[PDB]
Amino acid sequence: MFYGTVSSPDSGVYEMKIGSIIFQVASGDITKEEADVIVNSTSNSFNLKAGVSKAILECAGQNVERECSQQAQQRKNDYIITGGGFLRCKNIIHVIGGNDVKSSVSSVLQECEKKNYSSICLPAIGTGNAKQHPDKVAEAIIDAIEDFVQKGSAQSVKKVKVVIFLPQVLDVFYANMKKREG
Numbered sequence: 292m293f294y295g296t297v298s299s300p301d302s303g304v305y306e307m308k309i310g311s312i313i314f315q316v317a318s319g320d321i322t323k324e325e326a327d328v329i330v331n332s333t334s335n336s337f338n339l340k341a342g343v344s345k346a347i348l349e350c351a352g353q354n355v356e357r358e359c360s361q362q363a364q365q366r367k368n369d370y371i372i373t374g375g376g377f378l379r380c381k382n383i384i385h386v387i388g389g390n391d392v393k394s395s396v397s398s399v400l401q402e403c404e405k406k407n408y409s410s411i412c413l414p415a416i417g418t419g420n421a422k423q424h425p426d427k428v429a430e431a432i433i434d435a436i437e438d439f440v441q442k443g444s445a446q447s448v449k450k451v452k453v454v455i456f457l458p459q460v461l462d463v464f465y466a467n468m469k470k471r472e473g
């Protein structure tokens with residue numbers, strides 16, 4: 292009803308269509324990517340500096356760190372939106388690694404439509420300090436995108452890319468894409 296064919300457009304990149312959205316996966320350092328939004332996977336205090344979160348806050352810089360702690364003390368947040376700092380993006384959306392991954396990705400997609408953004412880059416949310424299982428994380432990320440497309444909500448969003456720190460986790464995402472393909 293939605294899934295296209297899995298192929299490799301560039302060395303180390305694997306893609307398929309989900310409705311009108313191009314979904315891609317690759318291994319690498321997410322802080323070297325350019326996109327309208329980059330997603331951080333962090334703690335419920337939005338101040339963690341371990342794994343992906345360490346790289347994102349160090350690269351983004353101290354003003355982004357300060358924006359995070361200011362919003363954390365203002366109210367109870369499921370996620371927060373900051374500037375991009377010295378990352379190559381318009382905004383960072385910081386999600387909680389321990390939360391339901393399908394819910395977190397659905398929120399990211401909705402916030403990107405609100406800003407008329409076209410591109411998103413995310414890590415394998417939850418697979419760091421939160422120690423969620425990679426197979427369940429891949430299923431949840433792709434399920435969120437399918438639901439967004441099924442509801443007719445994809446208008447501005449055209450490209451969603453997962454950049455994954457460990458090659459072994461990339462293999463789990465690729466297998467899930469092959470399970471779903473048309």
Ligand SMILES: CCCn1nnnc1NC(=O)c1ccco1
Binds near residue numbers: 321322456
């Ligand atoms: C310099 C050695 C790399 N390294 N070693 N242990 N953890 C990391 N890094 C990350 O988890 C990470 C995510 C994105 C960029 O870095």
Ligand SMILES: [Cl-]
Binds near residue numbers: 333389421422
């Ligand atoms: Cl995590």
Ligand SMILES: [Cl-]
Binds near residue numbers: 343457
């Ligand atoms: Cl990752």
